[PDB]
Amino acid sequence: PFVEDWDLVQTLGEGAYGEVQLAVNRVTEEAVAVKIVDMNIKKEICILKMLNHENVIKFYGHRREGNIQYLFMELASGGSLFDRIEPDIGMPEPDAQRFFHQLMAGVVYLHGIGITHRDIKPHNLLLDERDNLKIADYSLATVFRYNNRERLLNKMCGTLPYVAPELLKRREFHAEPVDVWSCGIVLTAMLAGELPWDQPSDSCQEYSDWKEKKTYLNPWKKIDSAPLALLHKILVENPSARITIPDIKKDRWYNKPLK
Numbered sequence: 185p186f187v188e189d190w191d192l193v194q195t196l197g198e199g200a201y202g203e204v205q206l207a208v209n210r211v212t213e214e215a216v217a218v219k220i221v222d223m224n225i226k227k228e229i230c231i232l233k234m235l236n237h238e239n240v241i242k243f244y245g246h247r248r249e250g251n252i253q254y255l256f257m258e259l260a261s262g263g264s265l266f267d268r269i270e271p272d273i274g275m276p277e278p279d280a281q282r283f284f285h286q287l288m289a290g291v292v293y294l295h296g297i298g299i300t301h302r303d304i305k306p307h308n309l310l311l312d313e314r315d316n317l318k319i320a321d322y323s324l325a326t327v328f329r330y331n332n333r334e335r336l337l338n339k340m341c342g343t344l345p346y347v348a349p350e351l352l353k354r355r356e357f358h359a360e361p362v363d364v365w366s367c368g369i370v371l372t373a374m375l376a377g378e379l380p381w382d383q384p385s386d387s388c389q390e391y392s393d394w395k396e397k398k399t400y401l402n403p404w405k406k407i408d409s410a411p412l413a414l415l416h417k418i419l420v421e422n423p424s425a426r427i428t429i430p431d432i433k434k435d436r437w438y439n440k441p442l443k
């Protein structure tokens with residue numbers, strides 16, 4: 185199959201909705217990614233056209249072709265961060281730190297334009313040929329700030345092991361601390377190659393253990409004291425006591441020179 189000048193050469197994977205194909209232009213040989221959706225997406229395109237940052241997947245544009253919408257996007261030839269995390273091990277701390285810096289640069293950018301991603305996790309964090317991180321998939325994204333006025337969110341969405349506890353507990357909540365939380369679970373996954381809990385609920389034993397500071401258990405025992413002190417500031421149950429991005433950027437481990 186093919187779309188105007190582009191051939192659909194192969195399946196890269198599935199986003200939150202629909203299929204993503206590698207599109208190669210037959211003329212120019214340029215390779216991009218195309219998300220193919222059958223038959224909400226006005227909002228998504230609208231958010232996609234806002235995006236201009238080196239740690240965010242770039243939107244090239246779209247074509248309706250009968251039933252099928254085709255959303256053209258930057259290709260990331262390095263695959264996902266998911267594939268760089270070795271189970272039970274993680275990755276080298278300097279690599280983790282570098283990816284964390286890039287993730288924060290992307291999140292700050294989004295938040296600065298009033299967008300929350302709402303599903304940060306390693307599958308949505310892609311790597312270009314130089315291992316630069318790009319935040320992908322704006323199908324759950326939404327505006328939380330417009331004309332300088334913040335709106336609280338109420339929709340439950342995301343992925344349970346990554347989702348902040350207020351989203352399970354509060355009728356309405358601030359957007360930014362939710363995305364911060366999920367960045368903390370990504371950090372843990374990078375440093376330990378395991379997720380700390382199935383969900384951050386009072387009924388989840390591993391979540392209770394963390395609240396009781398049992399860091400002699402896994403995954404925490406695999407993580408050095410400096411990044412762990414950051415994770416103690418991020419994975420804070422009360423979102424108004426949770427560290428903000430400005431303060432993450434002052435954290436000791438964040439600023440530690442590494443290999």
Ligand SMILES: N#Cc1cccc(-c2c[nH]c3ncnc(N4CCOCC4)c23)c1
Nearest residue numbers: 196197198199204217258259260320321
């Ligand atoms: N909407 C959206 C969305 C969600 C997730 C990823 C992509 C995606 C954009 N550029 C890519 N480059 C290389 N692989 C990619 N993926 C696609 C999905 O499977 C993983 C590998 C992408 C887009």
Ligand SMILES: [Cl-]
Nearest residue numbers: 373377378379
């Ligand atoms: Cl993992």
